[PDB]
Amino acid sequence: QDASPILTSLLDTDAYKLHMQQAVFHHYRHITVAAEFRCRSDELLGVYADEIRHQVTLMGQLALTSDEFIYLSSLPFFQDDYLHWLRDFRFKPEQVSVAVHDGKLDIRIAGLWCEVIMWEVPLLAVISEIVHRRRSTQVTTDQAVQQLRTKLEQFNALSADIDITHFKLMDFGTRRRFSREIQHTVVSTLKDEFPYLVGTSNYDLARTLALAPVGTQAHEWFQAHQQISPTLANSQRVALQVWLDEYPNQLGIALTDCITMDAFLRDFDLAFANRYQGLRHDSGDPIEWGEKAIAHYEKLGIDPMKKVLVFSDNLDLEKALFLYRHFYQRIKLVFGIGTRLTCDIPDVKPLNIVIKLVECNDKPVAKLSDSPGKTICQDPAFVDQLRKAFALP
Ligand SMILES: [Cl-]
Ligand SMILES: [Cl-]
Ligand SMILES: [Cl-]
Ligand SMILES: [Mg+2]
């Protein structure tokens, strides 16, 4: 139905959103933030504004169900104070401003971080579904399934000569999925047909398909700490410590490129390297990055085979297999694939859209990374300050 909701579950979002939301609820309940939409491509999405606005209002109706509560209570991640608060949580549509200027979609979101944090993934998934169902009216679940099966055949062919049994794939594709139904179809097909699927970031699919919910933290956790910790140069160490404080023995993958990998390794001391299970790559050459990670573990006396590298920088299954060949004899590996799984249909172009943190406590925050052109920060002075504090060139 035209005006009917695209989203019907509060769990149709990525696990890292709830994992971070709980940390923010426990530690930073009164901190405010602002976040903004960007369309990375040369695309104009202004025409979709009214429909996006309508869906944003609809999201005000989403509410945790009792079955969902019981499911979350079964997992090792959640405390009951948070779960009781989550049961009362409702999106507040007023937090989201949708405007159009020169045909460009402008979306800004502002309010308490523990509330605002929940918008990013479902709002992106709603924008994605709105745009695709308008532009690509002929797409069937069958087309999506057949493309997936062709790729799984190519994967099997290219891996026949190696021990592929340590290959691990995560679905990370909620945000820019072609639609909710396409994601459901491809993830269910993977569970039934691909031994190496280890889980999905989507909490609703983790529950309903009986898969492990995966995902730890995201850049906003590190970025927000740039306006939380008194010392800017320590903001990433504080973010790593507060995460362990919240999750001492679960969710132990640290994202490495809010600043740069080199800066990260300067912060990643023996205690962090022992308590965390592993590291996630999101920018720069993955070969160089993985080698840096392995060498760091060796320098600290840690057996790299007892740690994990997570790769998820807009991967496809072929690139993931190539990375596996390079690293699998030396360290444990997980590969998160996003749009290449949930929006890979003949004659359909994926959208390159994001919603990223721009302020915390009314002050700028930024992600640098090891890839140029990934900075949304519109405060060049702050970016300069951040570079200085982290001793970057
Ligand atoms: Cl746009
Ligand atoms: Cl579904
Ligand atoms: Cl792929
Ligand atoms: Mg220390």
Side-chain angles (χ1 to χ4, degrees):
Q1 332 189 326
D2 247 55
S4 66
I6 285 169
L7 302 177
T8 55
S9 176
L10 191 70
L11 295 192
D12 188 11
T13 187
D14 286 331
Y16 78 97
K17 299 264 65 175
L18 277 73
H19 297 164
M20 292 188 308
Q21 184 188 47
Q22 177 179 48
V24 175
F25 167 85
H26 287 142
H27 299 265
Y28 305 125
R29 179 99 176 250
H30 308 108
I31 289 176
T32 64
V33 296
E36 290 185 12
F37 173 87
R38 297 282 193 272
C39 179
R40 245 66 150 315
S41 71
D42 158 34
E43 200 133 42
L44 294 218
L45 303 175
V47 296
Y48 305 105
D50 287 352
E51 190 165 11
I52 294 168
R53 286 187 180 100
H54 173 74
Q55 294 289 329
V56 167
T57 293
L58 297 189
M59 289 175 59
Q61 304 298 134
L62 294 167
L64 197 72
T65 70
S66 281
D67 283 340
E68 291 171 344
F69 182 96
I70 285 292
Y71 170 74
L72 299 182
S73 299
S74 76
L75 302 170
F77 312 122
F78 298 108
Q79 292 190 233
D80 292 339
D81 64 344
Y82 168 73
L83 293 177
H84 279 257
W85 177 87
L86 184 63
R87 182 167 170 277
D88 292 346
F89 176 92
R90 305 286 186 274
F91 283 104
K92 295 174 184 184
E94 61 260 43
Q95 286 173 349
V96 178
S97 300
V98 178
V100 177
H101 304 110
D102 304 325
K104 291 171 168 194
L105 182 64
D106 277 350
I107 306 175
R108 182 173 163 100
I109 313 182
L112 287 171
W113 191 19
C114 64
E115 298 173 349
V116 159
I117 194 161
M118 301 290 282
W119 288 105
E120 174 199 9
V121 168
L123 185 49
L124 290 171
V126 157
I127 293 167
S128 197
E129 181 151 347
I130 285 169
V131 174
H132 291 301
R133 69 189 184 174
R134 272 206 236 174
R135 302 182 170 173
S136 298
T137 64
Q138 261 10 95
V139 169
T140 66
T141 59
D142 287 334
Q143 284 178 325
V145 168
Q146 188 52 53
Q147 171 64 2
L148 178 62
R149 288 182 172 144
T150 295
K151 297 186 292 184
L152 296 177
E153 286 190 19
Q154 298 169 172
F155 173 94
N156 287 328
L158 305 173
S159 64
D161 65 334
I162 63 179
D163 176 3
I164 197 57
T165 71
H166 321 279
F167 193 79
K168 294 180 166 180
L169 176 68
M170 293 180 299
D171 163 44
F172 270 5
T174 301
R175 278 175 286 185
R176 296 168 286 273
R177 61 191 182 193
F178 183 87
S179 71
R180 189 181 45 181
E181 168 177 14
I182 292 300
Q183 182 178 21
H184 177 101
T185 291
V186 301
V187 176
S188 184
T189 296
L190 285 173
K191 184 188 193 188
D192 295 352
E193 299 179 22
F194 193 61
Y196 314 103
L197 175 74
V198 300
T200 173
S201 63
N202 186 290
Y203 249 128
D204 175 51
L205 297 178
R207 188 180 70 89
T208 64
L209 297 177
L211 288 167
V214 294
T216 291
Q217 77 242 23
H219 301 279
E220 74 179 291
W221 176 250
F222 297 87
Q223 288 173 283
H225 277 85
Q226 300 165 3
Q227 298 301 343
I228 295 165
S229 72
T231 301
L232 183 54
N234 289 333
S235 60
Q236 171 167 253
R237 297 178 187 184
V238 175
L240 289 168
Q241 186 57 237
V242 175
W243 194 256
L244 290 176
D245 291 342
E246 184 75 5
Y247 298 115
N249 222 22
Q250 300 291 335
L251 308 181
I253 302 292
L255 175 60
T256 57
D257 72 334
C258 189
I259 306 307
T260 63
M261 177 59 146
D262 288 346
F264 181 92
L265 293 178
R266 293 194 286 275
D267 288 342
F268 199 59
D269 63 15
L270 183 61
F272 285 146
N274 279 317
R275 301 264 311 282
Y276 276 92
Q277 288 269 277
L279 295 184
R280 179 161 68 96
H281 170 256
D282 197 51
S283 68
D285 170 29
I287 301 290
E288 180 182 41
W289 177 91
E291 298 294 346
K292 282 187 177 180
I294 290 169
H296 191 78
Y297 282 128
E298 293 285 9
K299 300 180 195 291
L300 293 172
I302 287 163
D303 180 351
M305 288 264 15
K306 288 198 286 231
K307 303 290 179 185
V308 187
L309 301 185
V310 178
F311 290 91
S312 55
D313 184 15
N314 294 117
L315 290 179
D316 59 79
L317 205 48
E318 283 172 2
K319 194 172 174 69
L321 175 61
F322 303 160
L323 291 169
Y324 177 91
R325 297 184 160 247
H326 184 82
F327 289 111
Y328 90 98
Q329 298 161 286
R330 285 182 293 155
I331 188 154
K332 298 182 289 176
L333 299 163
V334 190
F335 300 95
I337 299 184
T339 64
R340 295 283 336 226
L341 177 64
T342 61
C343 195
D344 182 7
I345 303 168
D347 298 309
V348 172
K349 183 189 190 285
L351 301 183
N352 191 4
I353 51 175
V354 298
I355 287 168
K356 302 300 193 185
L357 199 69
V358 296
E359 290 169 63
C360 174
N361 275 322
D362 296 309
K363 287 172 166 182
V365 298
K367 171 176 92 178
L368 308 176
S369 90
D370 289 294
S371 277
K374 266 190 159 169
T375 305
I376 189 192
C377 187
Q378 288 169 307
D379 190 337
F382 179 73
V383 167
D384 214 76
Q385 179 182 168
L386 185 64
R387 298 193 60 90
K388 279 166 69 183
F390 279 92
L392 302 186

